[PDB]
From a paper:
The carboxysome comprises a polyhedral shell that encapsulates ribulose-1,5-bisphosphate carboxylase/oxygenase (Rubisco) and carbonic anhydrase (CA). In this study, we determined the homohexameric structure of CsoSCA from H. neapolitanus and investigated how it is recruited into α-carboxysome shells composed of CsoS1A and CsoS4A shell proteins, as well as CsoSCA encapsulation in the context of Rubisco.
We generated constructs that express either the NTD or CTD of CsoSCA, as well as a CTD deletion of CsoSCA; all three constructs contain a His6 tag fused at the C-terminus of CsoSCA for immunoblot detection. Therefore, we specifically purified T = 4 minishells by collecting elution fractions from ion exchange chromatography and screening for fractions enriched with larger minishells by negative-staining TEM. Despite these efforts, we were unable to resolve ordered internal densities in our cryo-EM maps. Closer inspection showed that the disordered internal density in both maps contacts the CsoS1A hexamer but not the CsoS4A pentamer. The minishell/CsoSCA-C map has less internal density than the minishell/CsoSCAΔC map, consistent with the smaller molecular mass of CsoSCA-C relative to CsoSCAΔC. Careful inspection of the HnCsoSCA structure reveals that the CTD is buried within the hexamer, with very little exposed surface area.
Numbering used by the authors:
A (entry chain D), I (entry chain D), J (entry chain D): 4 to 96
B (entry chain C), E (entry chain C), F (entry chain C), G (entry chain C): 6 to 96
C (entry chain E), D (entry chain E), H (entry chain E): 6 to 97
K (entry chain 4), L (entry chain 4), M (entry chain 4): 1 to 81
Amino acid sequence: VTGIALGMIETRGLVPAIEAADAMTKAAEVRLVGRQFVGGGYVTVLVRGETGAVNAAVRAGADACERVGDGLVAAHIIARVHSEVENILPKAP
Amino acid sequence: GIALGMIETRGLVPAIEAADAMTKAAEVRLVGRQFVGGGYVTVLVRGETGAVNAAVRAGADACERVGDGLVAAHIIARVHSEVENILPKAP
Amino acid sequence: GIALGMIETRGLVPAIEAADAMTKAAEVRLVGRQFVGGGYVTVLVRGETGAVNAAVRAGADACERVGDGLVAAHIIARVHSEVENILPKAPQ
Amino acid sequence: GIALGMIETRGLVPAIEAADAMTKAAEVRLVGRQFVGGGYVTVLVRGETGAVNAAVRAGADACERVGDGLVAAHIIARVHSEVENILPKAPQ
Amino acid sequence: GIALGMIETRGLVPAIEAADAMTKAAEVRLVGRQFVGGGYVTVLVRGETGAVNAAVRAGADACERVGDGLVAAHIIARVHSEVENILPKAP
Amino acid sequence: GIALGMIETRGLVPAIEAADAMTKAAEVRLVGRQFVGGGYVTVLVRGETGAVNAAVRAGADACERVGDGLVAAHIIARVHSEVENILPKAP
Amino acid sequence: GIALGMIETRGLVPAIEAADAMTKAAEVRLVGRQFVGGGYVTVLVRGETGAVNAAVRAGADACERVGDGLVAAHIIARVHSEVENILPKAP
Amino acid sequence: GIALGMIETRGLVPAIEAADAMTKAAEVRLVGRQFVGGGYVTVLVRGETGAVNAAVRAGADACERVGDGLVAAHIIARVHSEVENILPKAPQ
Amino acid sequence: VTGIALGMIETRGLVPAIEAADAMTKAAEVRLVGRQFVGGGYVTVLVRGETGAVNAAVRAGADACERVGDGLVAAHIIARVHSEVENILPKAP
Amino acid sequence: VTGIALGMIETRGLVPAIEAADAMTKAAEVRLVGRQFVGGGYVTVLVRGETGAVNAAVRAGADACERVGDGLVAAHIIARVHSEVENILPKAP
Amino acid sequence: MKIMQVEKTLVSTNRIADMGHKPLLVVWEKPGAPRQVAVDAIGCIPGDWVLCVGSSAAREAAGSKSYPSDLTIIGIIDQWN
Amino acid sequence: MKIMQVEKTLVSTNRIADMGHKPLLVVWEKPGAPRQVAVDAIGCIPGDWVLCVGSSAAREAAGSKSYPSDLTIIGIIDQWN
Amino acid sequence: MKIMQVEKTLVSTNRIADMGHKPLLVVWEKPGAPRQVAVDAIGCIPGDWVLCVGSSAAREAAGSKSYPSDLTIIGIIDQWN
């Protein structure tokens, strides 16, 4: 898979985060590039790919994970990521 | 087995009880205990679909009252190959 | 020594008090003090079933008052072999 | 490049959005993403004063909506030399 | 200087602002920034009693509105030799 | 298969109907019919977890109205080795 | 696998969505799409009992709102040998 | 070209209008027009994910008014390999 | 007759469809390229020709067939038809 | 320090003016080019530097001096100063 | 108004929300002329000659008083060389 | 609309108050073309090709009925040469 | 928006009443470019590079919903060559 678009989903807990990651990867052709434990319960999953693929993946993941567990906190999409942000974005999980 | 079962609890005692009841109720394989942070603790198992379902049901019923309680209980029949990268193999 | 005793407290002072109370009450070995995060501290012990039960009861009763209080106090008389992989063996 | 820009958010998604917004808005260098703990994420930038001000304003405006929202958005036009010892220089 | 000044803030931005205003307002020495956990961040300084008092007052007045706010601001004129063991020397 | 499914009925006709519907609905193995005494009759099966679940659900739905009715319907995913001593092998 | 899962939908788009979600959620084998006539469309799968159950549940939850909606969702654990004559083998 | 777009309409005129609208809006290939029976007509397209999404949105918006209206408008970004056996490849 | 414009009329039943086709062909200079049985009672008639001719034909056909039988369902006009749609559009009846 | 931008703060009295000058010079990288006694109590402090630096300095100075003493009268910023105004603007204090 | 020829379809996934479902086409006066993107309110295959309106009228031609557009296709020329 | 490529970020400290917090980018059709400044409503790194709207539509694209802008970026082209 | 450089001050005594007290400056892209007059809402010495907005946005930038202007200066570029 190629592309630089980034899709983010933040959930309160690990079970909704895993569900969202699975839903995203099954719905679209994206890449799971990392899972982050923010602290305080927040867990963030990141996906990379084409813009439309990331759009479909993030929509499906938010819809799937909005109910399981404590719920869904945020679901954001970034078309082009600045080169500086790539330093803080993980490459592989 | 490929099916994934998981329970999140608000504490470590309910997580241990859930994992113990899970492994005793069904012949599944405990693959990891994760400290999410903020009090959440998660336990994960792998196995057949029916065994995972029975184990998760038993664990969610056994950890309901122990400790601060139960947060979530989920079952995935066939998880995507991408999620294996973030799923732990051993605890 | 196969039974496992568990006590969870909001803070480290009640956890220390509970661990001391259990260890003084019965002949058990303190195996682990775990910082769950968010204020939860868990103490684990191993021993014969009745001793672990008595120690857990005494520790819960003793450390209920001190600090933010109790969260859980649970005894397992037969830990599954697979579960043992996530149970610490030596305190840190 | 001496001015310092700061944005704090409840969660990592708004923090990433803010960092991207600032970096796209102005010519600044992202120096640090800090996990404060308890849900707070802080992003730091360095650059000329006006550029840092514009970047911070744009980032706050962009990332206010996403996630749990904003916590702080502050610009310092002259960081003291002693304070620099606690400011990270490269992101991790 | 031996006097110790400290401010706790609910976030890292108020802590940085407090430390910056402190060091600019008085000629004190910043000795450490500590992440307590749960959101609290602490900054510590050393110096003369009057300088530390002025610095802490300025920092508490400057971090009051920035971010989530101010938690505490304290001054110790002569800290016991035992507390040096837990007090950081450099950040 | 190791999973155990059982239904108790208040009579022998509902027990026969439950066992028949069970074995027809799922490919399980009927291992015994027990006269508890006082009218209760129990039927037991062994097999895979999913097959046992489907069989027990079908039997509990088929014996609900026939005869005096249904007493209980239970599924054990992995029964302990000790219970094999009291579990019959053949009827 | 022998278990049969089926969903009927009032349209072809909900049927495609149901089949897609089914095959992605569980490792089952899609065996046929049938145009009943009058708008009804049916999709059928074969596989293990647990996999078929998970697939059918996911498909019924995914096709609920898409299109005109969901008509029926059924699972047969062990279908009779006679029904194989009318069950399609490939779509 | 792996994403699949779907539109269902009550009648053949809205189906033709939808197919034309999608094909004009994006670079997609119309693969199938299916007579479901009972008045339902379904049109299928294949292409890159974003193009299929744009085409489906435009077609739904265009053909909502004409005829008896819309029934469904759904985009699948990743069709399973097994599902492909029931998807027509060439229109008739 | 030449042209690529397409005129569509959908009626519930065959009698209104035949009436609409006759009215269209008599009113304007168009080509009857097909009649389709959609299923469920819907019947569709298609005409090809110049844009203005198709406009007049479709207007007259809708006006004529709006009353006979179960009635008129849809009457749409397409100026230029995409090449892909020509695959599903019939050539001759 | 370079730049031609000018920052002005007017206070009623000398104590707020001194406080504002100190706050400006500590907050940003500017130059104190003069203090003027207008008459009637008004005192004006002038700073020079880059546009953004002057902006930050003036904001901080107004915020700091708005309370001490009689208070703050005016706080204005000028991006580019005309060459004629440089005659009346003092060079050094 | 302004006569242009449709070149190709243009798709932007990250377009703003209020742009709606309307499609976009790339239109130029002639091969080699500077290219512009116009909101399609009629439906045009590549190649044909269309009428393009600009300024505030294009917003209404798109469909709303406040549609974010500045060049909208309002019709297809019947005959044109 | 009008296809342009982002060149660099432009910052003006003395900009009027009602311009808000929105950023500004320098956009041109191609290297060497005349340069224009567009209000960024999407977020674009330098180099990519974006859709720029003008006239009264740009004010709404910025975010307000009365935003002082005349050229606003409304989306990023997916594929473009 | 549109980047221009201030050349000189322009004064018109017989200007219409509703133009208010706002000053006018002559702005061009570069020496030799066609000259345009822009209402000054910021205050710019000759020589510097400024941001000029046009169309209906310039009226608001001037200060009123109905100010008779079509090109208003909205800010001064910090750094520009």
